[PDB]
Design a protein around this ligand. Structure first.
Ligand SMILES: O=C(O)c1ccccc1-c1c2ccc(=O)cc-2oc2cc(O)ccc12
Length: 173
C-alpha cells in the first residue's frame, strides 16, 4: 500500500465477476510496494470454499523468510459485482476491508484494488494487485492487463513491483 493526499478514488468494479472461478492457486505477478521495505518477488494466493465464503490464503517469501496471511472473502452484495469484503480476525481484533475487482476475464487474470483513509492526514492508502493463473502472463491476457493498467486513472503503473519467481527471490533461509 502507498500513501496519497486526498480522498480515495471513485472506482467501478466489474459487473460480470464469476464467483465459481475463485478457486485454486493464483500467482501474484505485480503489486504496489508496502512501507518499511516489507515486500517480496515470490508470492501467490490459494482459494478454498469455507461455507458461503472463500478462504484466501496468501504466501510470500520476503528476504528469505515465509510469511502467511489468511482471511475470508465474501461479496458485499450480488456475487457478480466485484465489490467484496475481506475479513481477518486475530485474537479479539477483526479487520474487515472492502476491495474491488477492477478487471478480470474470469480465467487467466484478476486485477484487484483496495483503498483506506488515513485517519490522521487528509489522505489515503491504496493497493493494487495482479493475480494470474500462470507464472508468466502472455497472449490476450497480457494484452488485456497492460491495456487496463495503462488506461486506468486509478493505477499508478510506475509504482508497480513485478515478480520474477526466480530461484533467488523464492529461496527460504
Ligand atoms: O490479503 C490481504 O491481506 C488483504 C487484506 C485486505 C484487502 C485485500 C487483501 C488482499 C491482498 C492484499 C495484498 C496483496 O498484495 C494481494 C492481495 O490479494 C487479495 C486477493 C483476494 O482475492 C482477496 C484479498 C486480497
Amino acid at each position: 500500500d502507498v500513501y496519497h493526499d486526498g480522498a480515495c478514488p471513485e472506482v467501478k468494479p466489474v459487473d460480470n465477476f464469476d464467483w465459481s472461478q475463485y478457486h485454486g492457486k493464483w500467482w501474484e505477478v505485480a503489486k504496489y510496494p508496502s512501507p518499511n521495505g516489507k515486500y517480496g518477488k515470490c508470492g501467490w494466493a490459494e482459494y478454498t470454499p469455507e461455507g458461503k465464503s472463500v478462504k484466501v490464503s496468501r504466501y510470500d517469501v520476503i528476504h528469505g523468510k515465509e510469511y502467511f496471511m489468511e482471511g475470508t472473502a465474501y461479496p458485499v452484495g450480488d456475487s457478480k459485482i466485484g465489490k467484496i469484503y475481506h475479513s481477518r480476525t486475530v485474537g479479539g481484533y477483526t479487520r474487515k476491508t472492502v476491495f474491488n475487482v477492477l478487471s478480470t476475464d474470469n480465467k487467466n487474470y484478476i486485477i484487484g484494488y483496495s483503498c483506506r483513509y488515513d485517519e490522521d492526514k487528509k489522505g489515503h492508502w491504496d493497493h493494487v494487485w495482479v493475480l494470474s493463473r500462470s507464472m508468466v502472463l502472455t497472449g490476450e491476457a497480457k494484452t488485456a492487463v497492460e491495456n487496463y493498467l495503462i488506461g486506468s486513472p486509478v493505477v499508478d503503473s510506475q509504482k508497480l513491483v513485478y515478480s520474477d519467481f526466480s530461484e533467488a527471490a523464492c529461496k527460504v533461509n
